[PDB]
């Protein structure tokens, strides 16, 4: 009896027993599964029922959870090499965090050498939010929210399959609303449940309208259980190539090509809390330098320093705020790291001095792969000589011959960033180069790792690693496609196991380079490839996008997913990397892009210039771009405080509407607009030819940003008028945000007067806060060298409370302007008290009753002190 008892079984709960090929009766019979072909090709024709799996043999309680020996039910194999006996272990890590793993007690299988996640042995946790039930015949696990008895994660729906190069487990989930998994192009933030496959294996590929695995390896996803906001997260700690399959019910199935099963289930009262718990586990995001938040200009192939200078000149002339000039691989001599082109980039050091004189920053690209060739003068490439002497390279399977691939400079060897000696070499290369070219930050690219020859110069050995028995739906269906051989050797292990950790290890390595090059500074690291917890070391951008309306639209989902992944400094190539942009598209994308946490206009090789001033000093594009970038720069104290909260508490920066308005099921699918923290709603034009956007307005009071006027919209879908020069910007009632008088660089804006915008809620209250430090020193938060404020308004009294003050230079700044929105009662008098001394009349205010706005001007409320302001 291989089949269910009823002839018309529930099809949505069929678990595919022939996941990898078109279903045939013979293969189904040979695998011992149930054959029932269907109306279509979405529903499985061959499925498992209870034919495969494991039984519990012995189970005992430990001080921190459970341990069960599992024995395999003696059925036919799927892909060979079954592990007959397996050890199931659980850990009640915190009240919100549950962990289980399934290992081989007789063979120490590959485990991810994560540099943050720690060994756990205690302390024993008395009151957990989760209950865990383990069924014995067959083996299954149920994770239950104790408060309402709701099962969150239920594996009894399918078998445990555990074999050397194929691991499989499924879980039924309690709601139809799931978010996360990457890096792929999802198009929609909320997951399509209709039989979708998501492959995960770091890969250099242009994002497009398909399910390809792209640059990062992110298994995390979360699920909102109900309108209460209760939510949970599922994280698999495994870096092997895999597929995540989603079907209606919903059921999620993992199909993984190696390693162990090591799952974390994370409970939260809200979706934001789930994300916070996730970051608590894998590592809180790095605090960026304040300048990282400035607008960046960039393109592949400016071709000469003369062109770079002209681009800089024209955008300065237009008054485009921008902190940073980025230079791509053309700055190098013949695309070799740690060189610059003495011909086309003659005078580069003096150009960097000019940037620095204008208070601007210079960022360079670095690729991991090192040329095996000579320099242009015929001399040895010292970077390679020194790498050879230090034995820093990834080796062939022989464990002694460096593997040769190909990238930009030609044939290349690959640093093993997991090797301590390689980290030192790299730090030393960055330091040597910084004496020649005084760059301020680093963009680390092609670190999947990418290769333009398949596997290596010698091809690949035909073995089980380069050609596994199960191949997930990865692009090309070939493990070593666009990368190095699976049997290549690193300090952390075989490429088969550690491939997806290359970008992760390189960011760690480059973080240590930064500490050598810029002692005790944050600098900037932008990475292409990421793994779980990469946000602790770097920023990310969505990679090599295209100049189309669709790609602009999809960038919001892309951004939001990385927020979930705890990589808050994220954005897309504004105006589009591949292809020529149009004036309309670039103007719209500049508006939206001013509100990416990471804001950079970047262009591919050979297409027309798309920096803002190129469209004309008097263009509508320059005017619109200058205006929204000035708004961005004005809001940087607010944005920066969000990054402080991400770094310390795991809160998101660019935030899904769902995170604030989960009580409203309309927010569950909302992905064409987003929030900065809880307080600012950004609604872009995303369709060619449009001056009107169908927008969902959540259940809050909203004030138009530019005019302060209350919108007559609440908890409704509106047709928002947004003509050519307008993007939708609304402030939410109940929040107080800090601002600073803007300038064209953050270097200048940081010296300017501060202000506060109070957007009053329904009961005329509001709250918020403000973090301020030197903007650059690593560990200011750890060492307590910062200023911290809370703000609170009720009944026409603003309280400004300094809860921490240990940054003397911050003290030279002052709040000089207070704006109150939605103020319904007239103002007779404004009074100010400092440090609980008596109130003095303040004469400079304007009460606009038509607009309900109170402007209080010419204040001098110095940072470091407490104030009260009454109207
Ligand atoms: C902002 O200012 C407004 C004034 O415009 C101010 O409103 C007042 O608040 C108090 C509450 O602190 C109200 O007093 C309550 O009145 C209701 C009847 O209307 C009673 O039910 C309440 O008694 C209960 O609660 C007490 C505890 O507060 C218990 O001791 C008692 O046994 C009862 O359980 C209570 O007396 C007052 O009526 C209003 N006035 C007006 C005009 O509405 C408001 O509190 C201020 N808001 C903030 C944020 O501070
Ligand atoms: C890759 O191959 C090189 C040898 O070509 C290995 O280099 C050794 O590195 C250690 C330092 O850690 C030296 O003490 C040895 O002398 C080196 N061996 C030789 C023969 O030069 C390197 O360890 C290999 N890397 C990996 C991870 O396999
Ligand atoms: C598929 O089959 C079932 C009964 O076997 C039927 O209810 C359903 O309508 C069929 N699907 C279609 C679209 O014909
Ligand atoms: C007060 O407002 C007036 C009106 O603009 C202005 O001229 C004056 O300089 C302001 N500032 C101070 C500090 O009083
Ligand atoms: Cl810095």
Curated annotation (Swiss-Prot):
Q: Glycosylation positions?
A: 39, 377, 395, 763, 795, 844, 866
Q: Which residues form the active site?
A: 445 (nucleophile), 544 (for isomaltase activity)
The coiled-coil segments of this chain are none
What effect on the protein does mutating residue 281 to P have, as reported in its record?
Answer: In CSID; causes loss of anchored SI from the membrane
Q: Where does substrate bind?
A: 204, 328, 528, 602
Q: Where is this region: Isomaltase?
A: 50-871
Which cysteines form disulfides? 3-34, 17-33, 28-46, 460-485, 575-586
P-type domain mapped to chain residues = 2-50
Q: Where is the signal peptide?
A: none
Q: Which residues carry this modification: Sulfotyrosine?
A: 177, 179, 331, 340, 607, 703, 705
Task: Report the superkingdom from the record.
Answer: Eukaryota
Please identify the protein, giving its name as recorded: Isomaltase
**Organism the protein comes from:** Homo sapiens (Human)
Gene of this entry = SI
